[PDB]
Nucleic acid binder design. Sequence first.
RNA 1: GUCAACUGUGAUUGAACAAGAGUUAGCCGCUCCUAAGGGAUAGCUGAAAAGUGUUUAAAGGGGUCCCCGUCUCAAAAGGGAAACAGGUUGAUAUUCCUGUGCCAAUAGUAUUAUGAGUUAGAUGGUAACAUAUAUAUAAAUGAACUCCUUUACAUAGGCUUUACACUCGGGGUGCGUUUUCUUUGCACUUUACCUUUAUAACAAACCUUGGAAUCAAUUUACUUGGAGAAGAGGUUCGUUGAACUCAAUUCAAAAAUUUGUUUUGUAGCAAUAGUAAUUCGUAAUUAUCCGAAGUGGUAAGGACUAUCCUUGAAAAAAGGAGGGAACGGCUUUGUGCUUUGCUACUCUUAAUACUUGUAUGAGCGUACCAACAACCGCAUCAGGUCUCCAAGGUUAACAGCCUCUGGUUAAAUAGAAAAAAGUAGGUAAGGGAAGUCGGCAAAAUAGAUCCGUAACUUCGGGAAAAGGAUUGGCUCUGAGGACAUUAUGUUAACUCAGAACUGAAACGGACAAGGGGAAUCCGACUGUUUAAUUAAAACAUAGCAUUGUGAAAAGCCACAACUGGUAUUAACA
Lengths: 49, 106, 43, 72, 85, 49
Amino acid sequence: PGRGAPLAKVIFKRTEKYGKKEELIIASEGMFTGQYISCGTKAPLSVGN
Amino acid sequence: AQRVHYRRHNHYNTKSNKVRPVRTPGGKLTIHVVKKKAGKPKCADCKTAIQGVKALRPADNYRARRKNRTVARAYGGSICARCIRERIMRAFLFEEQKCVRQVLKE
Amino acid sequence: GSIKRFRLKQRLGKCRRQNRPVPHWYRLKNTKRRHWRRTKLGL
Amino acid sequence: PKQITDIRKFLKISRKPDTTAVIIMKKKSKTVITKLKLRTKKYLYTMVFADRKKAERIENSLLPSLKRIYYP
Amino acid sequence: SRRTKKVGLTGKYGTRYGSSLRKQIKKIELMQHAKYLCTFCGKTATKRTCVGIWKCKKCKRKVCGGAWSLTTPAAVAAKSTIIRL
Amino acid sequence: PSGAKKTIDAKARAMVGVVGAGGRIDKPILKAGVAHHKYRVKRNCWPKV
RNA sequence: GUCAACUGUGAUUGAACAAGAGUUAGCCGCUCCUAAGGGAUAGCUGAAAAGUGUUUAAAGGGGUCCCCGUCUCAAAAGGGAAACAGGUUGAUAUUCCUGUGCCAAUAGUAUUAUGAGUUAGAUGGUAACAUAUAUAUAAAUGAACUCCUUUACAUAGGCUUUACACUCGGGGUGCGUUUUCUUUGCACUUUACCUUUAUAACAAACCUUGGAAUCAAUUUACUUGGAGAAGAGGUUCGUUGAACUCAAUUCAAAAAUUUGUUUUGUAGCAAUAGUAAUUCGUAAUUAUCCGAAGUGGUAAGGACUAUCCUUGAAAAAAGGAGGGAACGGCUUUGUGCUUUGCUACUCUUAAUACUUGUAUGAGCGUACCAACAACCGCAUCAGGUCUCCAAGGUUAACAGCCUCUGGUUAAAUAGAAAAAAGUAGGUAAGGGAAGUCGGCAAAAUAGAUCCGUAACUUCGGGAAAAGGAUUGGCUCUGAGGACAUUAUGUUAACUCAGAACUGAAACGGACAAGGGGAAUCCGACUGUUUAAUUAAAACAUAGCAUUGUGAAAAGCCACAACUGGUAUUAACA
């Protein structure tokens, strides 16, 4: 309610530990549930990366 | 008829304090506070209620017999059979693809 | 109100105990008496 | 309370040491009918016998040590 | 429908409130409550479920979009630009 | 989006595409009740007087 | 008991006064948990007092050296483990009593019984999914480490299902009216939790078959479908809570386990308890307790639908899934580990015994009032003061009006008189605002059905405009269902529309209930405000517009200082 922007729930996998971790990202227009999102230097150019 | 009186203490009609009047063997109209409505067990990835599994308050769910709490096949009461199928198919295809790509690359 | 805790309970019984008039057997060898509506305990 | 539909189960419950007493009552003639209520510490079991004579014979034959309770 | 001569859905607001604003509201409100076509499943069931969020009923999938309709031009132009190279 | 130009380090991150819910301030605000609900989840910044 | 004072009159009365008595909980609350919050630690500032609260941390918990990781108080209406019925006292009772139950536990070792598995970890069902009925539905290999889910949520609108309530009609009991008339009026005809409650029933969900356009199925509402509908056959959840062959029995057929007929049962609880009775003794017995159905007032559920530049707490607590650490009993060398030899055993609930501090149920609350005198207003003060239960007739109606159940007939006085004057009221010939700053006051108007409705307007309204008509009682006429015989029957609620007759032309017969029109001026609007002389033309408001500000060395503001707030922020700010 405070934010003007939708939030996006993104699941990442732990790398120093086992199991799945959830982060809270700010949504971008055209983002969707079941989308694969990439983050990093070696990420490809695409919306919401 | 007669009016009712509260019996259960904390005499308010809140969401957890909802009531059925009943007439007794003494012919008296008395009151019972019913147990609260409880959400159903669900498929996690679909976010929807699942077959077979009883819907019970956590007190009743603690006493409940073990057959009632879950489903026998695969990932049991956590996810549904259609969800399980999709994951099995996907898991099968990805391994097949992985080997073909390894053969392909050089 | 209806609900109370041990210290209040004890004190009220104490005040009740206290209120009773002076005994006449002592007298033959004064009083402060409380009336509930007119004088409140103020606890 | 739980009703019982099998004489063999009724006897098998009766034989347990948790049984304390048996209670008998016979109801209104329409033809008469007999409710025999058996008292274990855990529960009061009821068996409905159409014939009083059968019910009474079964009750006498069962454990003659245990207390018998009569409502009239 | 044929009830109103030309006001339409802002007839709910009636005689109260300035007319030009009611016309502006009419355009937004018409866009807001339309059932849009879902790209994923091929049915016209995509509705706005919260301010930036549009869910299709049939396939149960939430697309993040514009405020009053699914898409702005801006995102499309960006999307095409990324695709072309 | 203010029009400001800025020079920043190359390694600083950002997220591809535009923020969701575009056009938010372009629906006409009908009434005072709408303003009450908007500020209800924000703070005691309204009415200004 | 009682009458000194008080009980603004009397008083034997009393919430006054004196003496005593009275509040019993594993199951009802608090008690436990976190929230909005409060207090501290770590620090750091401040002469100290204090200001702060992870912000330069070598501080609390779990496993078998590792992994988590500030603490604590804060809801008697959020979350939350578990009990009801009848009876009982001078005053309490979910607590005493009687019955039935339910809940959390319940250590060690040894016996015993209960089912599993063995020569080490069950099965069914194509499927969705199911399966331990032992007194007792008890155990259906599983460690670290994980991943989920219940807890757990807005508002509005209808539809639908049940319950309680209400009603009508029949039989049965007793009581009432009873000149005359009444095949009558009334009362009573009761049934709880609990038993993975057992089943039936139904809105949904899911699955097998099936393969749909000439679209069909289909709700009050629109919904659904090749990402598989209708159809056909299942299965589940949730409501519910003895419905329905449900269970037992009989005789006939499959059969030397299913279906039809007979006999039982308020499913057990359950009648012995309740209730109306009925006799007898002067405490005991007897007789009774059930067939049809409608109304839709409450509440709960369900499937939904619609809206928000608003999408509407959390944790404690509990459950499910992934994973695959570990692994027979008896005997012994060698080195807990390994080779030799043996095989009713290994698990698992419950009961029992013996040992181990005394191996079951903590603690506090529970009276009465809740203002019609117990609370606050200096006081038995016409003021104020939070929540739920909600009967009949009338009706749109839980309004107003009268009535049954329950309550009351007391209000700081009484009597007698009846003029002025006062005050709350009525009513007035002819006129009709000419009185008075002012139509102020009062009255007129008002409900339904049928007609009819302008200037003007942002075309949405204006609007109940204006302006008309009708409305009782009675006896009918017409229209709207459900079942089952192939055009004919059996049968229920009520609402509508029309025609006569009728009467002091009277009927929204009390009752509730708008005065209207022509205009101007101001403010657009819903909103807000001078508690106790002020509701508006003032404030807010949408709309229009401006300014500053790109971030920890920013804007703007707060702090003594350190530091905060805007900020869980980010120029659509």
